[PDB]
Design a binder for this molecule. Structure first.
Ligand code: GSU
Length: 463
């Protein structure tokens, strides 16, 4: 039975690298008909919190990576938080001591750094007196090897590793011990994780061997890097899923990009995880690190925004806005769709879409600084707007030809240059100097809105 896991340490937000690691596990499980387990690795009490755990679960959900077992839904191999499994680690570390593969180390009490002696017999008298006591794993001579799905055959000389602690004096396991005990007990068949854990693998294999357990199949996924080839960090730019979500990157687009990284996909670069799920093959994954390109991500997002159904885009837009704390006012559905169809040709993120959609959705839009200073303040601004209002008002047919003629007549009759006429009207009805086609904009806004806004702009000018 195929069982994979995403085992995040909730010490912060879900990094896109983590999302990519989770994506490949999720795709392998759904394609193979297996299970995707979510294990929270929160033994670092100081840095982990339920707030971060929750933020991570929310981000995974938003990325469309639902799990079959976890801290919230449970399952038959829990608890799913390592902080809730301290007794399990204790019992299994004890099995190793009893089998002479691990031993207790007793330290001085006044000077905790001073080792007093080692023993296979639990030192009750020292424990009761407050002496620190740890458990160390006994490294056996020999070789430790495994065939990684992406990194190939790996070999390790045991002799180069000194006996190491698996249980700390505070009662908590070390990360490597907890991971092996949990991957084993949660019956994980495949461990797909970031390459930053490749070096921890020989040690983990030694523990599996000490218990007489069969180790799962391993695959270490190269990391997502910044342009200088170091792991993607804050200094490179955004790194959390939550950030891209807030900026308006569509989930399906972010996941498309994370899968696209380093993959010379055959066919369209624009795709959904869903359609690539059936032919998913772990070996298609690049064995080299991948560089995150913010510009390319935005380009991918733009492609999705224009390709999806207008109403699909509308839902994405509405939910994003609500999530961002600035939900869309209530408007006519046809009008909503029309303005969306026009505004989406020009933007690449839901946030950029929100900015240009605002004047279409609300009458209280603000006038840009440059519009007021560069155009509205000119001497001819008033008569241009008054004449525009007069001619538009007399229009009996609100089509683009008549709208175009109305603007043409304003400059040809000498009220101002063509540029000033166009910009004065554009800013008057949107408050912006850059917008989708001016005739399309006026047409969809309608006669009444156009008149109201020209009047509104005139009153504003009068200050
Ligand atoms: N820049 C990057 N690019 C691409 N992947 C990256 C990454 N940084 C971290 N990762 C990978 O994301 C997953 C979560 O990282 S994490 O929350 O710190 N947790 C841990 O590393 C450990 N708790 C995982 C232990 C295990 O799986 O055996 C881990 O699989 C981690 O290897």
């Amino acid at each position: 039975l195929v069982r994979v896991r995403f085992a995040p340490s909730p010490t912060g937000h879900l990094h896109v690298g983590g999302a990519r690691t989770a994506l490949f596990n999720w795709m392998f499980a759904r394609k193979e008909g297996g299970k995707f387990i979510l294990r929270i690795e929160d033994t670092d009490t100081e840095r982990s919190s339920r707030e971060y755990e929750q933020q991570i679960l929310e981000s995974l959900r938003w990325c469309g990576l639902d799990w079959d077992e976890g801290p919230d839904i449970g399952g038959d191999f829990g608890p799913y938080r390592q902080s809730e499994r301290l007794e399990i680690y204790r019992e299994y570390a004890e099995k190793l001591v009893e089998d002479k593969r691990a031993y207790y180390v007793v330290y001085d009490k006044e000077d905790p750094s001073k080792e007093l002696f080692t023993t296979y017999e639990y030192p009750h008298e020292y424990k009761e007196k407050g002496h620190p006591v740890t458990i160390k794993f006994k490294v056996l001579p020999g070789k430790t090897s495994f065939e990684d799905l992406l990194k190939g055959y790996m070999e390790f000389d045991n002799s180069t590793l000194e006996d190491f602690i698996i249980m700390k004096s505070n009662g908590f396991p070390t990360y490597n011990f907890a991971v092996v005990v949990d991957d084993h007990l949660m019956r994980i068949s495949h461990v797909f994780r970031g390459e930053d854990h490749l070096s921890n693998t020989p040690k983990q294999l030694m523990i599996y061997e000490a218990f007489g357990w069969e180790a799962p199949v391993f695959m270490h996924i190269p990391l997502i890097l910044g342009s200088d080839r170091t792991p993607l960090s804050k200094r490179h730019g955004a790194t959390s899923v939550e950030h891209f979500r807030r900026e308006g990157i569509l989930s399906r687009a972010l996941m498309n990009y994370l899968a696209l990284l380093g993959w010379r996909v055959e066919g369209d670069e624009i795709f959904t995880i869903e359609e690539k799920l059936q032919s998913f093959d772990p070996k298609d994954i690049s064995n080299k690190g991948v560089i995150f390109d913010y510009q390319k991500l935005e380009w991918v997002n733009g492609k999705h925004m224009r390709r999806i159904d207008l109403e699909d885009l509308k839902r994405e837009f509405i939910e994003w806005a609500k999530y961002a704390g600035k939900e869309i006012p209530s408007v006519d559905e046809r009008y909503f769709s029309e303005t969306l169809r026009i505004c989406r040709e020009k933007v690449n993120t839901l946030s950029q879409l929100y900015d240009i959609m605002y004047p279409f959705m609300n009458d209280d839009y603000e006038y840009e600084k440059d519009y007021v200073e560069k155009f509205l303040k000119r001497e001819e601004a008033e008569r241009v707007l008054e004449e525009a209002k007069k001619a538009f008002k007399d229009l009996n047919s609100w089509n683009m030809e008549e709208i175009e003629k109305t603007l043409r007549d304003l400059s040809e009759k000498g009220l101002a240059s063509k540029k000033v006429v166009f910009q004065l009207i554009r800013g008057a009805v949107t408050g912006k100097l850059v917008t989708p086609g001016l005739f399309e904009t006026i047409e969809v806004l309608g006669k009444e809105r156009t008149l109201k806004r020209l009047e509104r702009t005139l009153q504003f000018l009068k200050k």
